Design a protein around this ligand. Sequence first.
Ligand SMILES: [Mg+2]
Ligand SMILES: [Mg+2]
Ligand SMILES: [Mg+2]
Ligand SMILES: [Mg+2]
Ligand SMILES: [Mg+2]
Ligand SMILES: [Mg+2]
Ligand SMILES: [Mg+2]
Ligand SMILES: [Mg+2]
Ligand SMILES: [Mg+2]
Ligand SMILES: [Mg+2]
Ligand SMILES: [Mg+2]
Ligand SMILES: [Mg+2]
Ligand SMILES: [Mg+2]
Ligand SMILES: [Mg+2]
Ligand SMILES: [Mg+2]
Ligand SMILES: [Mg+2]
Ligand SMILES: [Mg+2]
Ligand SMILES: [Mg+2]
Ligand SMILES: [Mg+2]
Ligand SMILES: [Mg+2]
Ligand SMILES: [Mg+2]
Ligand SMILES: [Mg+2]
Ligand SMILES: [Mg+2]
Ligand SMILES: [Mg+2]
Ligand SMILES: [Mg+2]
Ligand SMILES: [Mg+2]
Ligand SMILES: [Mg+2]
Ligand SMILES: [Mg+2]
Ligand SMILES: [Mg+2]
Ligand SMILES: [Mg+2]
Ligand SMILES: [Mg+2]
Ligand SMILES: [Mg+2]
Ligand SMILES: [Mg+2]
Ligand SMILES: [Mg+2]
Ligand SMILES: [Mg+2]
Ligand SMILES: [Mg+2]
Ligand SMILES: [Mg+2]
Ligand SMILES: [Mg+2]
Ligand SMILES: [Mg+2]
Ligand SMILES: [Mg+2]
Lengths: 70, 87, 101, 116
Amino acid sequence: KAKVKATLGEFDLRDYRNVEVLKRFLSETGKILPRRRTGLSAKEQRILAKTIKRARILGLLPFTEKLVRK
Amino acid sequence: PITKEEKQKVIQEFARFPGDTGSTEVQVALLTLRINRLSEHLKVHKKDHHSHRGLLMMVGQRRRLLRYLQREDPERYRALIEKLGIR
Amino acid sequence: MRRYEVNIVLNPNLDQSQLALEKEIIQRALENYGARVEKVEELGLRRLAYPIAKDPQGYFLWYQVEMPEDRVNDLARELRIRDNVRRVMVVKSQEPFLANA
Amino acid sequence: KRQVASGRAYIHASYNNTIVTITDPDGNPITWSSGGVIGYKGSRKGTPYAAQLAALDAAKKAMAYGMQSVDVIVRGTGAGREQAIRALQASGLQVKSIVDDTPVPHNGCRPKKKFR
RNA sequence: GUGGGAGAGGGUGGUGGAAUUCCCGGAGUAGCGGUGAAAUGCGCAGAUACCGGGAGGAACGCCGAUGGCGAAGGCAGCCACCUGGUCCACCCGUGACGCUGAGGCGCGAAAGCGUGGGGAGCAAACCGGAUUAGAUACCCGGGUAGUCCACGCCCUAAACGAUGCGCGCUAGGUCUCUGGGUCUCCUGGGGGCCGAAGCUAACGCGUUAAGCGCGCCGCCUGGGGAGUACGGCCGCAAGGC
Ligand SMILES: [Mg+2]
Ligand SMILES: [Mg+2]
Ligand SMILES: [Mg+2]
Ligand SMILES: [Mg+2]
Ligand SMILES: [Mg+2]
Ligand SMILES: [Mg+2]
Ligand SMILES: [Mg+2]
Ligand SMILES: [Mg+2]
Ligand SMILES: [Mg+2]
Ligand SMILES: [Mg+2]
Ligand SMILES: [Mg+2]
Ligand SMILES: [Mg+2]
Ligand SMILES: [Mg+2]
Ligand SMILES: [Mg+2]
Ligand SMILES: [Mg+2]
Ligand SMILES: [Mg+2]
Ligand SMILES: [Mg+2]
Ligand SMILES: [Mg+2]
Ligand SMILES: [Mg+2]
Ligand SMILES: [Mg+2]
Ligand SMILES: [Mg+2]
Ligand SMILES: [Mg+2]
Ligand SMILES: [Mg+2]
Ligand SMILES: [Mg+2]
Ligand SMILES: [Mg+2]
Ligand SMILES: [Mg+2]
Ligand SMILES: [Mg+2]
Ligand SMILES: [Mg+2]
Ligand SMILES: [Mg+2]
Ligand SMILES: [Mg+2]
Ligand SMILES: [Mg+2]
Ligand SMILES: [Mg+2]
Ligand SMILES: [Mg+2]
Ligand SMILES: [Mg+2]
Ligand SMILES: [Mg+2]
Ligand SMILES: [Mg+2]
Ligand SMILES: [Mg+2]
Ligand SMILES: [Mg+2]
Ligand SMILES: [Mg+2]
Ligand SMILES: [Mg+2]
């Protein structure tokens, strides 16, 4: 399995209002994916984090979710 | 904060000649502007120490330059002091 | 003055007159604090990822503005007073850092 | 005297005891069980077997109300947590889904000395 | 100077979600909790588990790192305001304006003190339960000061890199954070690991020196007695130098 950035277009890392793109950086649980899966730069990663959290406060993205199967 | 035009006004005011940026006059001027700003900031926010250190360092630099000016050309030193109204 | 973005999330169930009243108060508030309105995006009804004020959904507005800095926080404080306004987030506008470009 | 026939089955597991609660679709409980409910009393309540028997008991008590469709919800980590689900699948009850909801903080509270 | 950059650097205000606890309500029986095993404890005035609602305090999961910032202490949700340090490029300005720094002044984790608040969770002291030859200990159940905020004191530490600050010089290899560049790479500035020369009692250090040099400050002179006595100064006290 490849990474998130690997399959994606040209997208703003600073857009907190864009759900369609951001969601893909989260797991089944609302947790933020590590760099191993996101494949970003540490800089990219930080900006992603901040942005995600912004989206969360706006209710656009989940703070957490529940794990299926198991 | 201090924006570009704010800075430039002072630079133009204190420059010995046109184009002059880094002369002792101008340095002490800008420095003293930052000083005043920081002091007004430390009127409130008395709990901010990390900035107060910066203030100390700035003050020190200013006193260094002034001591230099007074050493070389006492007249210009008197002029600066008179203008800025410090020390 | 600097460049900001005001995100407003209000109650989904407002009808025409109500919503228009709220947007009226918003506009008035913006003008009062001296915010020039450059552009605006109203996304309206969207499905929240978690319930906000017991509501599963929300009404979304976005305002790109230029306004005096010292008046920002107050301008936020004034907006949250409305019961019908659930969320207000003001953010300094920033350049679009890109990736995978 | 209800006849519910569909609902959620919560399994709360710990290293001390494992308990089970059957509930109606909007969350109100119907019947329940635990290691203490059955014969076991002391640490014996922590064994997976106890979890099994508990799941079973609650399952029967659910059959009494005519329960059929069951959505499993798991909380906590403990021996026999999985065993509980195992017995619950073989309970005769048909399990629609299983989810792990185990509460985790965002590090709000300081725990007891033995938890640090 | 101009133009760019990264950051849990600092201060003020606002705000968000998870969880614990408590209160309200629904529904729901016979235990829960806890341990090596147990008991104290809570439960028929209905607990635990489950749903919904509310109150309040404290701390910010994932991101998160072998990472970043700061002079040190230390700094992690998000937003805004106020503000310090710093790095790079351009080679534009002043023209030795430099380095260090006894005393002074300021900062200074935690615990602790004063006055006023606040109090969920944790928890010195303390009250109990079991263990055990015994318990004041290790395990378990409660629990006050305190932990939290404001303001004023306290000045300590394994305050640790057990390595004062600055500058010049002396092979590289590799991982990395952050700039610039004509972007297999090169060039700055940080963070690590191996290792030339060399140093070192050894371990080890090795362009982030413990190498070769220079300047300046602090400190050492066998162990115990002893960071004790006396004196002084600081302190509300504890006590500190
Ligand atoms: Mg038990
Ligand atoms: Mg910060
Ligand atoms: Mg801050
Ligand atoms: Mg109840
Ligand atoms: Mg009993
Ligand atoms: Mg009783
Ligand atoms: Mg009683
Ligand atoms: Mg509840
Ligand atoms: Mg209360
Ligand atoms: Mg971590
Ligand atoms: Mg570190
Ligand atoms: Mg430390
Ligand atoms: Mg800054
Ligand atoms: Mg030149
Ligand atoms: Mg010249
Ligand atoms: Mg010095
Ligand atoms: Mg202190
Ligand atoms: Mg303290
Ligand atoms: Mg006190
Ligand atoms: Mg205790
Ligand atoms: Mg005893
Ligand atoms: Mg005892
Ligand atoms: Mg306790
Ligand atoms: Mg030396
Ligand atoms: Mg290297
Ligand atoms: Mg580059
Ligand atoms: Mg580089
Ligand atoms: Mg030597
Ligand atoms: Mg040797
Ligand atoms: Mg080595
Ligand atoms: Mg050196
Ligand atoms: Mg040596
Ligand atoms: Mg002697
Ligand atoms: Mg001696
Ligand atoms: Mg002493
Ligand atoms: Mg004497
Ligand atoms: Mg004395
Ligand atoms: Mg006295
Ligand atoms: Mg002492
Ligand atoms: Mg001292």
